[PDB]
Design a protein around this ligand. Structure first.
Ligand SMILES: Cc1nc(C(=O)NCC(=O)O)c(O)c2ccc(Oc3ccccc3)cc12
Lengths: 11, 243
């Protein structure tokens, strides 16, 4: 999961 | 007592700029802040739903600022994405709690959250944090005589961020390396700063432990809140922190 964190981190 | 090397002044600049750029309201927080009304966050008869509602609305930007802080550190950007996620989950509540504690105001007995919301010990307690409210307020009171500057706050944040014991990390050694770089630069800055507090460096290291205890205990409060509060009442970024 961690979808939204991953988005915020990546872009 | 050794003072910063040139390379450490460069690190100090980078870390301090990253903090300053990502700390809500910057130098105008005291002007901006609004006192949460006293009728919010009173003791029930468990969780005061109105204070809870206020706090959940400001958690996402607070976490986001920590994300932005980390992304401004080249060391953190070098890590694999999965390590970045684990470090972020681990330190977010620690860093936000530090950021609240340094905004303790003895005149009103409040901390300022999100650069704008000033809350009392009881409000933060009854909005969901329980004893962790007391921990953070205590911390805040104890930091007043420390006179920490932007640099010192930023360095404490970087030490918390680069914690190689978070579960699941892959680059454990590299992350300890980065932490120790920060620690040495910090000690050397502290040496240069000459605070009028005895044993200042070992005392700071105890404050780091206090923040780590706060961080761990936020997870505990989450589990307790989930008895009364369905998960959908929490914003999804906060849910990701604890999964
Ligand atoms: C510990 C901390 N801090 C901050 C904060 O703003 N810190 C200072 C800053 O970031 O400038 C918050 O906004 C928080 C919001 C909620 C919270 O827990 C709760 C989460 C869900 C429900 C109740 C409380 C802790 C916070």
């Amino acid at each position: 999961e961690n979808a939204l964190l991953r988005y915020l981190l990546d872009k | 007592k050794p003072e910063p090397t040139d390379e450490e002044w460069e690190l100090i600049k980078t870390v301090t700029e990253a903090h300053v750029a990502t700390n809500a309201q910057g130098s105008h927080w005291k002007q901006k802040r609004k006192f949460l009304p006293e009728d919010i966050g009173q003791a029930p008869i468990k969780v005061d739903l109105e204070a809870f509602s206020h706090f959940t609305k400001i958690i996402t930007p607070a976490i986001t600022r920590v994300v932005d802080f980390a992304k401004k550190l080249p060391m953190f950007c070098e890590l694999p994405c999965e390590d970045q996620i684990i470090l972020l989950k681990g330190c977010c509540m620690e860093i936000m709690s530090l950021r609240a504690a340094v905004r303790y105001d003895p005149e009103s007995e409040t901390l300022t959250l999100n650069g704008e919301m000033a809350v009392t010990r009881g409000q933060l307690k009854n909005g969901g944090l329980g004893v962790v409210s007391d921990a953070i307020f205590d911390l805040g009171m104890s930091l007043s005589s420390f006179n920490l500057d932007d640099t010192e706050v930023a360095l404490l944040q970087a030490v918390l961020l680069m914690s190689s014991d978070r579960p699941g990390l892959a680059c454990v050694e590299r992350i300890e390396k980065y932490q120790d770089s920060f620690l040495l630069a910090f000690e050397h800055y502290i040496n240069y700063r000459k605070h009028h507090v005895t044993h200042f460096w070992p005392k700071l290291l105890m404050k780091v432990t206090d923040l780590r205890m706060i961080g761990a205990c936020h997870a505990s409060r989450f589990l307790h809140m989930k008895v009364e509060c369905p998960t959908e009442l929490f914003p999804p970024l906060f849910l990701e922190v604890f999964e």
